[model samples]
Target chain A: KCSLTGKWTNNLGSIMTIRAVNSRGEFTGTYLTAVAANPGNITLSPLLGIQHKRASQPTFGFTVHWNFSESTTVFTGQCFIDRNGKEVLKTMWLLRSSVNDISYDWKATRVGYNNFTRLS
Target chain B: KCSLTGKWTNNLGSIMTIRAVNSRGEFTGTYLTAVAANPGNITLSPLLGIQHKRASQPTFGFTVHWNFSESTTVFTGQCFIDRNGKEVLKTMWLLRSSVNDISYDWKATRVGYNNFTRLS
Candidate 1:
């Protein structure tokens, strides 16, 4: 089956580590984001989600929650594998506690891997 | 240093897989929850947080966010090692996007380990 259980780095020098496990057509995992400032050092502030899809597919969607700072935001994104086998993620952040539900977009590419391991 | 990076289970037959990494006193990881309904099968609906503390310490605080169904809830908890060297978690969930900021409590014990891996 196609797996997204690995460590990936983006072109902007940020790292996204995903560890997903699938069973009975359900996919679940944790998504960790480490910014360029901390490099490999990741914090719990910006956490994401990995849900289920086709076992051997390369396209998926994810959710992100950021609640460690002054503003709390959530993100929804779509991810797919490009022709060069690089995973591309395009996400939009929704500011929940805002007046008009302000939002923004972010896009990243999987450039390489980092030093992280996957749990079962 | 003492590490909290591992898989743990609860008395209610729920499995919690925590894969945490530490850097400069900042501990970050993804918390995966698998209910008894699907056994080892986990979904991304209920996700928790692992933040920073003493590198070798067993006492820590965590956060959880659940946004899969009709209602969205968030949980804040404190975890510590008991006299028997088992991890004990006492959490209170706050129902966001609700009236009066409704909340509830849940407690669990680390019963055993599950088949999950930690990402760096």
Candidate 2:
């Protein structure tokens, strides 16, 4: 059973440093967004997530609070291993901003992908 | 300031009964998946998530432990109001099963969307 408790860097230059993963897969971390939602307002934010508590269960989900931008982003992804033993987390995220009726809400919603690799 | 602390049903009849949403946007809930990954093993599963704790801040994210299926799923979305004041939640999720190298991992990954409406 490998713990994903480590520092990870993403494709977008963002960083997520998982502090702990409990026995039940509840995790807490500090995240610094490389792409600030609002210029000069980006700060280190807190993250919360959960994953399956079993070995080899590579799926997990997390939330990042874009407090400065009044938005929130959720991510769901799986962790995979490269042939060289390096680990990678492939993720898809939806960022919710500018809330309103469903239609405009749909329009302002941002969707994207980020792949994370171990930094330490 | 309204709480998402209630029962919600998705387009597929999957139910999420949230117990609480805290001051910091943290939430906990119980979920019953209508589309069980494995038959005869379905039951109430625990869920954990976070959302912005501001009024009209409709963005939220959660994770459901499909313990029965030995898998995990995550959702991220925002809540919207219909013309009639009815609320709807639109979500996107990623399901991870069968862990392995990144290539084969992609083949077994499941992606989906679900729309949840208030049941209570």
Candidate 3:
């Protein structure tokens, strides 16, 4: 089992809230993004791990499940990031089967972190 | 210049409207998606092309700009599809610099097309 904790910011230099989670199953992850005026309000926590790996030192990639409580949207996708000192989302791929298997891609730059945690 | 006229259906088996456009700038494309309750309505048209390619058979990939008139939102991204028989969106990458450089990913399966037009 493993856990992760961190924060993220956008190009506009806005920091959001952060959270962490531990999991044991096919997959596990904990992350948060921006939600309107809310900062790092724990968009995703204890995410279901689909497939992931850490290559090199600060670079990591993995697929996980994301369920939005506010909307009837449950999405799955792969994310790549570098968590050496702070959190940086390099790129992401998301798919919504219920939304007609709609898939999209993303790329993010490292901003900062509110906190970092690892639970084993 | 090219104008694509086609319809798209979701996994729920719902068919939407379609539109087309011609281009003469950095990019040019015409496509549509669902919003609230409109079907095949033109969500994007005369898109500004970024980069595009046709590998073989009917697979194609290209990047373009999308501006939603209803909303003060402009999006740029790459798209791949097979338009041999109909429009099949394979995947897409979107980025919004104005919105803090927010990035996202997507993948779409083609359902069909309503009409296509190509104007030079």
RMSD of each: 14.9, 2.2, 9.8
Second chain alone, TM-score for each candidate: 0.45, 0.88, 0.31
**lDDT of each residue in B47-66, candidate 2, tens digit only:** 88887777574677787877
Q: Report the C-alpha lDDT of model 2 over A1-120, residue by residue, as the tens digit.
A: 445689999999999899788888889888889895565888887788887666563678788876676677777777776556777887777776755557665565677788898896
**Model 1 over residues B1-120: C-alpha lDDT tens digits?**
335566555444444545654552223333445443343444454343333344222223233333232223323223444355544443333222211111211111112222212222
- Name the runs in model 2 displaced over 4 angstroms: A82-85, B82-85
Worst 10 residues of 1 chain B by lDDT: B101-110
Write model 3 residue lDDT over B9-83, tens digit each, in one string: 443232333333223223344444443223334445333333332332222233333344332223322222345
Candidate 3 error regions (>4 Å) = A1-44, A50-120, B1-44, B50-120
Better of 1 and 3 by lDDT: 1
lDDT of 3 at B3: 22
lDDT of 3 at B115: 25
Looking at model 2, the pairs that clash are: none
**What is the CA-based DockQ of model 3?**
0.09
Q: Per-residue lDDT of A6-103 in model 3, one digit per residue for the tens? A: 44444433332324333322434444443323333435533433323342222233333334433221223223334554333443323222333233
Candidate 1: residue B106 Cα off by (Å): 21
Can you tell me which runs of candidate 1 are displaced by over 4 Å?
Answer: A1-120, B1-3, B24-48, B55-70, B95-120
Candidate 1 TM-score to native: 0.31
Q: Which candidate is the best by DockQ?
A: 2
* Model 2: residue A102 alpha-carbon error in angstroms: 2.0
Q: After superposition, how far is residue B99 of candidate 3 from its true place, in Å?
A: 5.7
Question: What TM-score goes with each of the models?
Answer: 0.31, 0.88, 0.34
